Design an enzyme around this catalytic site. Structure first.
Site, mmCIF file in Angstrom:
data_model
loop_
_atom_site.group_PDB
_atom_site.id
_atom_site.type_symbol
_atom_site.label_atom_id
_atom_site.label_comp_id
_atom_site.label_asym_id
_atom_site.label_seq_id
_atom_site.Cartn_x
_atom_site.Cartn_y
_atom_site.Cartn_z
ATOM 1 N N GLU A 117 0.851 -1.204 0.000
ATOM 2 C CA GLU A 117 0.000 0.000 0.000
ATOM 3 C C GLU A 117 0.886 1.253 0.000
ATOM 4 O OE1 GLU A 117 -3.834 2.055 2.224
ATOM 5 O OE2 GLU A 117 -2.836 0.372 3.188
ATOM 6 N N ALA A 258 1.663 -0.627 10.778
ATOM 7 C CA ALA A 258 1.194 -1.992 10.500
ATOM 8 C C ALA A 258 0.350 -1.962 9.244
ATOM 9 C CB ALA A 258 0.392 -2.526 11.711
ATOM 10 N N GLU A 260 -2.830 -4.135 6.905
ATOM 11 C CA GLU A 260 -3.938 -5.099 6.966
ATOM 12 C C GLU A 260 -3.978 -6.145 5.849
ATOM 13 O OE1 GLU A 260 -5.741 -1.357 4.844
ATOM 14 O OE2 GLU A 260 -4.179 -1.781 6.327
ATOM 15 N N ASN A 261 -2.831 -6.576 5.332
ATOM 16 C CA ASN A 261 -2.866 -7.560 4.230
ATOM 17 C C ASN A 261 -3.747 -8.744 4.613
ATOM 18 O OD1 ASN A 261 -0.491 -6.079 2.959
ATOM 19 N ND2 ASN A 261 0.465 -6.935 4.787
ATOM 20 N N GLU A 294 -5.779 -3.072 12.658
ATOM 21 C CA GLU A 294 -5.517 -3.960 11.525
ATOM 22 C C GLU A 294 -6.609 -5.003 11.410
ATOM 23 O OE1 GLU A 294 -3.530 -2.876 9.448
ATOM 24 O OE2 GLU A 294 -2.624 -1.431 10.825
ATOM 25 N N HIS A 297 -9.761 -3.502 9.896
ATOM 26 C CA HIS A 297 -9.643 -3.326 8.436
ATOM 27 C C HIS A 297 -10.152 -4.548 7.672
ATOM 28 C CE1 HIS A 297 -7.864 0.478 7.361
ATOM 29 N NE2 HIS A 297 -6.726 0.285 8.004
ATOM 30 N N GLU A 316 -9.817 4.504 6.217
ATOM 31 C CA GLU A 316 -8.980 4.948 7.340
ATOM 32 C C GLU A 316 -9.745 5.738 8.395
ATOM 33 O OE1 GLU A 316 -5.830 2.720 5.929
ATOM 34 O OE2 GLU A 316 -6.414 3.476 7.912
HETATM 35 C C1 LIG Z 1 -1.525 2.165 5.951
HETATM 36 C C2 LIG Z 1 -2.242 1.051 6.730
HETATM 37 N N1 LIG Z 1 -3.402 0.751 5.883
HETATM 38 P P1 LIG Z 1 -2.606 1.399 8.254
HETATM 39 O O1 LIG Z 1 -3.143 0.231 8.878
HETATM 40 O O2 LIG Z 1 -3.692 2.373 8.267
HETATM 41 C C3 LIG Z 1 -1.324 1.967 9.016
HETATM 42 C C4 LIG Z 1 -1.512 2.691 10.383
HETATM 43 C C5 LIG Z 1 -1.493 1.717 11.588
HETATM 44 C C6 LIG Z 1 -1.781 2.464 12.886
HETATM 45 C C7 LIG Z 1 -3.106 2.616 13.310
HETATM 46 C C8 LIG Z 1 -3.392 3.309 14.488
HETATM 47 C C9 LIG Z 1 -2.347 3.859 15.227
HETATM 48 C C10 LIG Z 1 -1.022 3.731 14.811
HETATM 49 C C11 LIG Z 1 -0.734 3.022 13.637
HETATM 50 C C12 LIG Z 1 -0.499 3.797 10.653
HETATM 51 O O3 LIG Z 1 0.703 3.582 10.693
HETATM 52 N N2 LIG Z 1 -1.007 5.020 10.875
HETATM 53 C C13 LIG Z 1 -0.215 6.135 11.383
HETATM 54 C C14 LIG Z 1 0.070 7.164 10.288
HETATM 55 C C15 LIG Z 1 0.867 6.588 9.134
HETATM 56 C C16 LIG Z 1 2.266 6.587 9.188
HETATM 57 C C17 LIG Z 1 3.011 6.066 8.126
HETATM 58 C C18 LIG Z 1 2.356 5.544 7.007
HETATM 59 C C19 LIG Z 1 0.954 5.521 6.966
HETATM 60 C C20 LIG Z 1 0.207 6.058 8.022
HETATM 61 C C21 LIG Z 1 -0.945 6.820 12.506
HETATM 62 O O4 LIG Z 1 -2.195 6.821 12.501
HETATM 63 O O5 LIG Z 1 -0.267 7.358 13.417
HETATM 64 ZN ZN LIG Z 2 -5.590 1.855 8.676
#
Ligand SMILES: C[C@H](N)P(=O)(O)C[C@@H](Cc1ccccc1)C(=O)N[C@@H](Cc1ccccc1)C(=O)O
Ligand SMILES: [Zn+2]
Length: 866
Positions: A117, A258, A260-261, A294, A297, A316
């Protein structure tokens, strides 16, 4: 590259319904064979345009015929003169070891893993790398057995075999059609924690958590959290897992938290690994929330995906809302709400006031990886929460059910989601939709009047959203504006007009409107924008006594914290102005009194007390100002801490001692008491030097958990205590081999109030526990300095900017995604004084001239320099 526009969306000329992948895996040279079943939907003369980045094409066949009607162009393989339905076979090579960007297939330590992604799959093979193309994947992985004993991809193991020369293979089938951003592959040697979850209808799901050898002692909490997430989604949303196996792999090198694959989530180890001596309460609760995120998702992202990347918030915003509701239901709802509002006001509002401002559904994107933002995520969730506020839980869930009924197995839009909510509930969301289209933070101004003759209370409410660089036109929004009215005993006054009850959620839909309430027998104290009911700035001319009244009487704990924030804001603003004129802190007696009352209140939840006693961060404080003076802000924050430390010394120590806990438990009541104890510690660190030094060093040494040890270490750094250097060295000596644990120490170094902080930070580029190859290290040292120490980053000599330019010059080539996260503080230049703007512009112009400037940085630099 050129910008892409939401209004240009067009259905694909071709679909791929099924893809069979084979990977001949090797770190230096991986050979990918991809056999796709394609179906033309567009014009019969349309070529098939496949996306590809940094691929070595070996061959192209159509129905096993070597194809001559194709051309490679920038980022693409264009295939002409095709049948309506056919089998495409592509063979190409890639080099995981050379992939420093961590996009596509790459190396994480000794393991190979993927991140696809948003548009990473095109770095693996030539494909329709767009999320509205949904294919059934089968994945065969062939590799050295000794080096890669575990070969994982999405779904179920359907075949396996052994080969000559010490190689083996495994084949996976994922029955659910998916966009390629949900593809994952992992190869390596792992310890595996295995467990089971039985769904409410009786499906037994095998749970498998893969970690580096030696990390099993840090796996059970993540596994527990997965089971908790599964149970909660059943109870709250009525959703069950849909496969036989749920795999999670924790990797060291990862550009996000993280991913969600489907059936094979890949996690940054930060959001998996915990034991009580390495991880804090905050780590535990973050692991819980990210494991939940995750998992959630699986429905909000995977079973229903995104038609195009402009719809990112469809998954998101909704998944963040779900993770917030999960954490809130399991823990303290008030603390979660408070934390999420600190993030909105302190970080997301700043983005909405910046050159990067965008609606939660963007209209224009150059580099999609730049749009994984506070806006899309956190403001996105606030928009979902406003729908929840307008509909109520029952109708909201009916909307969720209709959304899944209509869109399960498809790639949907934000508009589809809103339409499902509207149709299920019969609540008109036509005006509400403007929240998806309009950027910037609305400002809601409230004026009131109490009329003793008529016993009526009138609220005159206005709204405006200031223009943003992306949008010259702004219009009124549908703002759910929750209120509560209190009599002088703190009793709720029933809301009514003309003999009928009125809903406490006011519909603020106009530029200006009045709301009249009758049978208000005595002058009320209002609580306004309750539970932060809309993501807006509130302008109301509070008296101090209205605010301290709310701190004592408001019925929702959030309101009590919020009132304290409004009270402090006045005095933070006062004292920054004083600082600029060389004058010391001034605070009325009745303010310290309000915080004394919080400390001594027996009836208050320690969870709430702890948050009231946690001063706004320097980034939260910055948003109180049109022009940010980061040195004044930092020094005022310390001065405020010192003043309260002095005025409340006895009470702080009493409450610190009262909340001592000999047993360490990751349980919400215990976490609350400990958070309160350590909130007190922050102030106690600024007491008489010897007294403070003894207390802080004692806690560091006597701590039976990392929460308490880190709190003490943080206080030694914050207050520059005599014991600081000793404690910091002891921590280094004990923990240098553990990157996640050292990240806390890098953050402390980077955010230190010491005069020599930049010198120290630069020196730490050579520290044994630091490396430029690891995004976590980068964020904990360099990111923490630039983003979380604005006072030092904005040193008047410009040294902070020059440092960041050096780091970005490296990272632009090495890892553009991490570079683009790191550049953010520089793009806020217009919030600063003219001398600072000049230096920040010069830094940005230097970056603009880089050879091989990444699209990631180009997009942000361009906007910042406009
Ligand atoms: C890109 C994925 N589809 P994701 O699961 O949304 C990644 C997400 C995981 C997460 C969720 C909640 C709290 C912390 C981490 C993620 O890393 N989100 C970050 C922002 C981010 C950083 C780097 C790349 C993408 C998003 C955040 O919300 O602080
Ligand atoms: Zn997400």
């Amino acid at each position: 590259p050129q910008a892409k526009y939401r209004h240009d969306y067009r259905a694909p000329d071709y679909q791929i319904t099924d893809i069979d992948l084979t990977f001949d895996l090797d770190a230096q040279k991986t050979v990918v064979t991809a056999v796709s079943q394609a179906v033309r939907h567009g014009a019969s003369d349309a070529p098939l345009r496949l996306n590809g980045e940094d691929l070595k094409l070996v061959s192209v066949h159509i129905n096993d015929e070597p194809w001559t009607a194709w051309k490679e162009e920038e980022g693409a393989l264009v295939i002409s003169n095709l049948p309506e339905r056919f089998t495409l076979k592509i063979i190409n090579e890639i080099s995981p070891a050379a992939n420093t960007a961590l996009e596509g297939l790459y190396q994480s330590g000794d393991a190979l893993c993927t991140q696809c992604e948003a548009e990473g799959f095109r770095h693996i093979t030539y494909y329709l790398d767009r999320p509205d193309v949904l294919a059934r994947f089968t994945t065969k992985i062939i590799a050295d057995k000794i080096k890669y004993p575990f070969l994982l991809s999405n779904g179920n193991r359907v075949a396996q075999g052994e080969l000559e020369n010490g190689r083996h293979w495994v084949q996976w089938q994922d029955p659910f059609p998916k966009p390629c951003y949900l593809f994952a592959l992992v190869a390596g040697d792992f310890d595996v924690l295995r467990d089971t979850f039985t769904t409410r209808s009786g499906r037994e799901v095998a749970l498998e958590l893969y970690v580096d050898r030696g990390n099993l002692d840090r796996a059970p909490w993540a596994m527990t959290s997965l089971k908790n997430s599964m149970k909660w989604d059943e109870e709250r949303f009525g959703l069950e897992y849909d496969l036989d196996i749920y795999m999670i792999v924790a990797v060291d090198f990862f550009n996000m938290g993280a991913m969600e694959n489907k059936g094979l989530n890949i996690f940054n180890s930060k959001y998996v690994l915990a034991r009580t001596d390495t991880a804090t309460d905050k780590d535990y609760l973050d692991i819980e929330r990210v494991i939940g995120h995750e998992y959630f998702h699986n429905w909000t992202g995977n079973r229903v995906t995104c038609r195009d990347w402009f719809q990112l918030s469809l998954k998101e915003g909704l998944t963040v809302f779900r993770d917030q509701e999960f954490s809130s239901d399991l823990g303290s709802r008030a603390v979660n709400r408070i934390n999420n509002v600190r993030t909105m006001r302190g970080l997301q509002f700043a983005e909405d006031a910046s050159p990067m401002a965008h609606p939660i559904r963007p209209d224009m994107v150059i580099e999609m990886n730049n749009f994984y933002t506070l806006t899309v995520y956190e403001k996105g969730a606030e928009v979902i929460r406003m729908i929840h506020t307008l509909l109520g839980e029952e109708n909201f869930q009916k909307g969720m059910q209709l959304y899944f009924e209509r869109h399960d197995g498809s790639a949907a839009t934000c508009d589809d989601f809103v339409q499902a909510m509207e149709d299920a509930s019969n609540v008109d969301l036509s005006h509400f939709r403007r929240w998806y289209s309009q950027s910037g933070t609305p400002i809601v101004t409230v004026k009131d009047d109490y009329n003793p003759e008529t016993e009526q209370y009138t609220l005159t409410i206005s709204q405006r959203t200031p223009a943003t660089p992306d949008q010259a036109e702004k219009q009124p929004l549908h703002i759910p504006f929750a209120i509560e009215l209190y009599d002088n005993e703190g009793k709720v006054i029933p809301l009514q007009k003309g003999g009928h009850p009125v809903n406490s959620v006011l519909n603020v839909t106009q530029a200006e409107q009045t709301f009249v309430f009758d049978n208000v027998y005595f002058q009320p104290v209002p609580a306004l924008l309750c539970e932060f009911s809309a993501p807006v700035k509130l302008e109301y001319k509070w008296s101090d006594q209205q605010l301290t009244f709310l701190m004592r009487h408001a019925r929702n704990d959030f309101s009590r914290w919020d009132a304290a924030q409004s009270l402090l804001a006045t005095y933070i603003k006062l004292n920054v102005a004083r600082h600029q004129q060389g004058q010391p802190l001034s605070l009325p007696v009745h303010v310290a009194d309000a915080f004394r009352a919080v400390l001594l209140d027996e009836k208050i939840d320690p969870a709430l007390a702890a948050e009231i006693l946690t001063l706004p961060s320097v980034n939260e404080m910055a948003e109180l100002f049109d022009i940010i003076d980061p040195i004044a802000i930092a020094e005022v924050r310390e001065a405020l801490t010192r003043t309260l430390a002095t005025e409340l010394a006895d009470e702080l120590l009493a409450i610190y001692n009262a909340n001592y806990q000999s047993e360490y438990r990751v349980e919400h009541e215990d976490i609350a008491k400990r958070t309160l104890r350590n909130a007190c510690l922050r102030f106690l660190a600024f007491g008489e030097t010897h007294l403070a030094d003894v207390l802080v060093s004692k806690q560091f040494h006597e701590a039976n958990n990392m929460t308490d040890a880190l709190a003490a270490l943080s206080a030694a750094v914050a207050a520059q205590l005599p014991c600081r250097d000793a404690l910091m060295q002891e921590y280094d000596d004990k923990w240098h081999q553990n990157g996640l644990v050292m990240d806390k120490w890098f953050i402390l170094q980077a955010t230190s109030p010491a005069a020599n902080v930049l010198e120290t930070v630069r020196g730490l580029l050579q520290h044994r526990s630091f490396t430029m190859s690891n995004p976590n290290r980068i964020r904990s040292l360099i990111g923490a300095f630039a983003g979380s120490n604005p006072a030092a980053f904005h040193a008047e000599d410009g040294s902070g900017y020059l440092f960041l330019v050096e780091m970005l010059t490296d990272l632009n080539s090495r890892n553009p995604q991490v570079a683009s996260r790191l550049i953010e503080p520089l793009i806020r230049l217009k919030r600063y004084d003219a001398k600072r703007q000049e230096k920040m512009r010069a830094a940005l112009e230097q970056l603009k001239g880089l050879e091989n400037l990444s699209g990631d940085l180009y997009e942000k630099i361009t906007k910042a320099l406009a």
